[PDB]
Amino acid sequence: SKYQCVKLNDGHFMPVLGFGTAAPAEVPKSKALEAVKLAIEAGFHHIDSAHVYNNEEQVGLAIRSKIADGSVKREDIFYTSKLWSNSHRPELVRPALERSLKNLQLDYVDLYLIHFPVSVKPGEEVIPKDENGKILFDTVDLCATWEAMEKCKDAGLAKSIGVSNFNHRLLEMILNKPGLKYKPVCNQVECHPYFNQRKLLDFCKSKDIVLVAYSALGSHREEPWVDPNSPVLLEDPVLCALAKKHKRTPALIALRYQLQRGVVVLAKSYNEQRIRQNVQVFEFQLTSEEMKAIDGLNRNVRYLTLDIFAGPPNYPFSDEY
Amino acid sequence: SKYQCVKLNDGHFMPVLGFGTAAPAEVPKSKALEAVKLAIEAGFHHIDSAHVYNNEEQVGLAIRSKIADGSVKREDIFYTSKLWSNSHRPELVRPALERSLKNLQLDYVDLYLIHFPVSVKPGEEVIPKDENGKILFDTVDLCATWEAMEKCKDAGLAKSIGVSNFNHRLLEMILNKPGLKYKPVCNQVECHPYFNQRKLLDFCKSKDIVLVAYSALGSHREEPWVDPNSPVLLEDPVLCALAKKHKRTPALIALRYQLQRGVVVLAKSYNEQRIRQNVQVFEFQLTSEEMKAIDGLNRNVRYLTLDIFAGPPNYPFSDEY
Ligand SMILES: NC(=O)c1ccc[n+]([C@@H]2O[C@H](COP(=O)([O-])OP(=O)(O)OC[C@H]3O[C@@H](n4cnc5c(N)ncnc54)[C@H](OP(=O)(O)O)[C@@H]3O)[C@@H](O)[C@H]2O)c1
Numbered sequence: 053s054k055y056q057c058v059k060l061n062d063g064h065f066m067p068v069l070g071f072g073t074a075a076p077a078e079v080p081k082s083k084a085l086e087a088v089k090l091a092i093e094a095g096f097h098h099i100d101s102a103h104v105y106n107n108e109e110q111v112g113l114a115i116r117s118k119i120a121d122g123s124v125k126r127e128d129i130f131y132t133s134k135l136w137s138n139s140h141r142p143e144l145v146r147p148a149l150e151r152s153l154k155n156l157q158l159d160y161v162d163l164y165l166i167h168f169p170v171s172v173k174p175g176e177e178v179i180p181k182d183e184n185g186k187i188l189f190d191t192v193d194l195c196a197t198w199e200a201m202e203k204c205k206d207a208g209l210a211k212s213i214g215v216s217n218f219n220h221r222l223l224e225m226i227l228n229k230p231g232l233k234y235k236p237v238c239n240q241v242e243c244h245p246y247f248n249q250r251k252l253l254d255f256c257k258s259k260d261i262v263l264v265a266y267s268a269l270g271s272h273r274e275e276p277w278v279d280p281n282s283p284v285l286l287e288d289p290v291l292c293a294l295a296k297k298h299k300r301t302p303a304l305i306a307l308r309y310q311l312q313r314g315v316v317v318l319a320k321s322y323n324e325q326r327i328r329q330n331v332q333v334f335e336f337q338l339t340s341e342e343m344k345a346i347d348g349l350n351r352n353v354r355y356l357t358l359d360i361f362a363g364p365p366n367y368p369f370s371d372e373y
Numbered sequence: 374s375k376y377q378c379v380k381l382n383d384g385h386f387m388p389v390l391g392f393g394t395a396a397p398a399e400v401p402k403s404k405a406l407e408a409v410k411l412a413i414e415a416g417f418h419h420i421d422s423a424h425v426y427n428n429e430e431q432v433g434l435a436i437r438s439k440i441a442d443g444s445v446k447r448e449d450i451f452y453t454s455k456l457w458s459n460s461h462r463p464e465l466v467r468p469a470l471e472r473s474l475k476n477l478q479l480d481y482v483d484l485y486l487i488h489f490p491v492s493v494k495p496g497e498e499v500i501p502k503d504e505n506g507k508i509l510f511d512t513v514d515l516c517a518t519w520e521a522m523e524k525c526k527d528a529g530l531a532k533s534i535g536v537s538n539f540n541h542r543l544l545e546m547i548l549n550k551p552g553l554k555y556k557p558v559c560n561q562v563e564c565h566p567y568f569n570q571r572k573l574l575d576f577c578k579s580k581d582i583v584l585v586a587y588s589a590l591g592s593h594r595e596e597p598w599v600d601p602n603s604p605v606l607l608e609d610p611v612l613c614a615l616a617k618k619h620k621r622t623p624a625l626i627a628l629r630y631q632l633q634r635g636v637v638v639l640a641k642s643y644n645e646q647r648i649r650q651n652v653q654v655f656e657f658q659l660t661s662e663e664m665k666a667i668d669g670l671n672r673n674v675r676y677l678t679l680d681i682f683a684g685p686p687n688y689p690f691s692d693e694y
């Protein structure tokens with residue numbers, strides 16, 4: 053019942069290694085169920101999902117099954133969900149959380165995040181478009197969205213609340229909000245050796261906000277969300293060399309890198325072998341020279357731009373950080 | 374319930390912040406009984422002692438007391454004891470552990486360490502001396518001592534075993550020992566901003582050995598163990614400046630420093646105020662720049678030379694590291 057975790061700025065604890073559940077559309081949802089169960093069996097205690105992934109029914113079932121058969125206790129599973137952009141309006145935040153909880157059949161989520169800062173029109177469609185294919189953007193004061201999130205925490209529906217894909221300006225906007233009750237516990241953003249977020253990371257550290265890295269292994273590289281011409285992280289010569297030296301894998305080196313720099317890292321895999329392999333990140337350590345070697349791979353390569361949401365002022369990736 | 378721990382190379386888990394129990398000779402033993410109780414209440418889950426500290430009876434009482442009134446469970450207390458140098462002989466190791474356990478009235482210790490690599494003559498006196506006032510050293514093959522330690526772990530008397538005050542050469546001696554069954558899980562050594570052990574730390578990381586830092590706050594400065602004219606760590610301008618900005622203390626900066634470089638840190642305090650303060654190490658973080666600033670304080674200042682044990686082949690502090 054023991055594993056590595058970090059204390060959040062709201063007193064709760066977050067397991068430093070999380071399991072990602074997002075998969076491509078061409079992948080059946082039944083795969084999420086089997087994958088999450090194998091992840092729990094392997095030793096993952098942190099599970100990351102979201103309403104927009106359209107898999108919470110399956111992920112929730114995996115969790116309930118592992119709890120129901122004695123494999124794990126609810127307090128030993130840290131589950132994260134995310135508020136999708138079609139529910140940024142204050143009065144729609146709690147209903148969105150409650151909808152996810154119903155799909156999951158869980159009483160609460162350990163963490164609820166604002167998934168993306170750009171808002172879209174209310175409704176069932178996650179990406180609402182008009183008759184001419186234009187995304188239907190909505191104007192919403194995120195500070196108001198946050199107050200609705202804070203209320204979800206006070207209601208016990210979400211143990212901790214945080215954000216995702218927020219930049220320096222957006223975080224400051226929340227942190228400088230008059231009457232702020234709860235700082236976000238984290239900022240889940242893309243982070244790997246080719247885009248190490250050094251600057252944003254230091255900022256988060258200075259405010260005791262945990263940076264949670266997604267696409268830590270180089271992302272799924274699926275179109276039209278990621279450009280195929282982008283470099284392949286796991287094929288990097290330095291990572292391959294270090295892997296050989298430590299008798300590990302490029303993926304493990306990339307994951308250990310994050311843990312040693314203070315980042316909570318996610319890792320998605322639907323392959324039984326690789327799922328069990330990623331938990332090996334707690335079996336070795338990198339020296340200072342090796343960590344510096346990895347820092348040197350940084351090359352401003354952002355795999356997930358989500359530019360279909362570019363235009364509105366809240367688009368997060370235009371600023372330096 | 375939950376707290377920050379690191380996975381050891383034998384599968385067990387060690388809390389990253391430990392409470393030191395060594396106190397000056399001119400300090401009643403009852404002070405340890407009270408201190409440990411407060412440390413446990415403050416949130417310490419890792420307690421560090423040793424046979425040579427002559428306080429295990431009290432430390433044990435404090436622990437069993439907190440377990441008695443339900444303040445904590447045995448499994449949520451990581452207790453460390455150390456084999457003193459008068460019991461390095463193979464046939465004396467288990468008896469020494471059993472003696473510590475009897476004083477503690479505990480069934481097992483979570484960690485048992487070889488306290489210091491230089492051996493002295495068997496007997497009740499911990500620092501036996503001859504007529505001319507010289508220490509009565511003994512000669513013992515540390516590999517034999519280690520094999521005895523391994524048997525203590527297999528017997529269940531110690532969950533994990535490690536070493537303390539070992540240098541590079543001595544660690545390799547154990548790591549390269551024929552028939553090795555268990556690597557040491559840690560090497561507890563002096564470590565702080567004025568002597569950051571970067572080289573030894575990296576070596577340990579390369580072998581997945583956790584470095585545990587003692588005198589992480591500049592030591593007790595008690596003579597004749599420590600030179601009174603030595604620099605005062607907690608009065609360092611950089612640490613003081615960083616402490617001012619973060620609204621903390623120089624001690625907290627020095628402790629946080631260790632946690633972020635992958636070091637498990639000990640903190641001794643018999644003062645209820647400073648005890649509760651040290652636990653605050655989990656409330657903030659240091660940026661890359663602040664860490665670099667602390668790395669710059671390194672100045673080869675070793676407080677505990679234990680030069681009285683100099684001479685034998687195993688004296689550890691003569692080598693570069
Ligand atoms: N909040 C956000 O905006 C956001 C955005 C993107 C992702 N995320 C979260 O982050 C999670 C992970 O990110 P991601 O989906 O971009 O992918 P990722 O973790 O970077 O991994 C990408 C690929 O790595 C492979 N892989 C996993 N372990 C491996 C190993 N040991 N060796 C070699 N390849 C390995 C996987 O393939 P196999 O499955 O075939 O093993 C997977 O397709 C997601 O599932 C989601 O929960 C959040």
Ligand SMILES: NC(=O)c1ccc[n+]([C@@H]2O[C@H](COP(=O)([O-])OP(=O)(O)OC[C@H]3O[C@@H](n4cnc5c(N)ncnc54)[C@H](OP(=O)(O)O)[C@@H]3O)[C@@H](O)[C@H]2O)c1
Nearest residue numbers: 393394395587588589590591592593624640641642643644
């Ligand atoms: N294995 C070995 O060879 C070895 C050697 C030495 C020590 N150790 C272990 O390491 C533990 C700690 O090391 P240490 O005794 O050298 O001392 P330390 O932890 O470096 O601290 C030295 C002094 O710091 C003071 N202090 C504690 N917290 C403070 C705070 N927040 N602000 C200001 N001052 C503070 C304490 O005074 P107050 O008590 O008055 O608060 C104490 O006398 C020992 O008790 C022992 O368990 C192991």
Ligand SMILES: C[C@]12CC[C@H]3[C@@H](CCC4=CC(=O)CC[C@@]43C)[C@@H]1CC[C@H]2O
Nearest residue numbers: 074077102104105106178179277356358
């Ligand atoms: C890529 C990411 C996960 C996959 C989704 C995407 C938003 C649009 C989408 C709509 C869907 O119906 C399926 C999933 C997805 C393609 C998300 C933006 C942030 C990240 O979590």
Ligand SMILES: C[C@]12CC[C@H]3[C@@H](CCC4=CC(=O)CC[C@@]43C)[C@@H]1CC[C@H]2O
Nearest residue numbers: 395398425426427489499500598677679
């Ligand atoms: C300084 C240190 C802790 C205090 C002890 C010392 C060895 C001699 C001693 C004998 C005693 O009866 C009291 C404690 C102490 C003074 C230890 C050597 C390594 C370190 O743990």
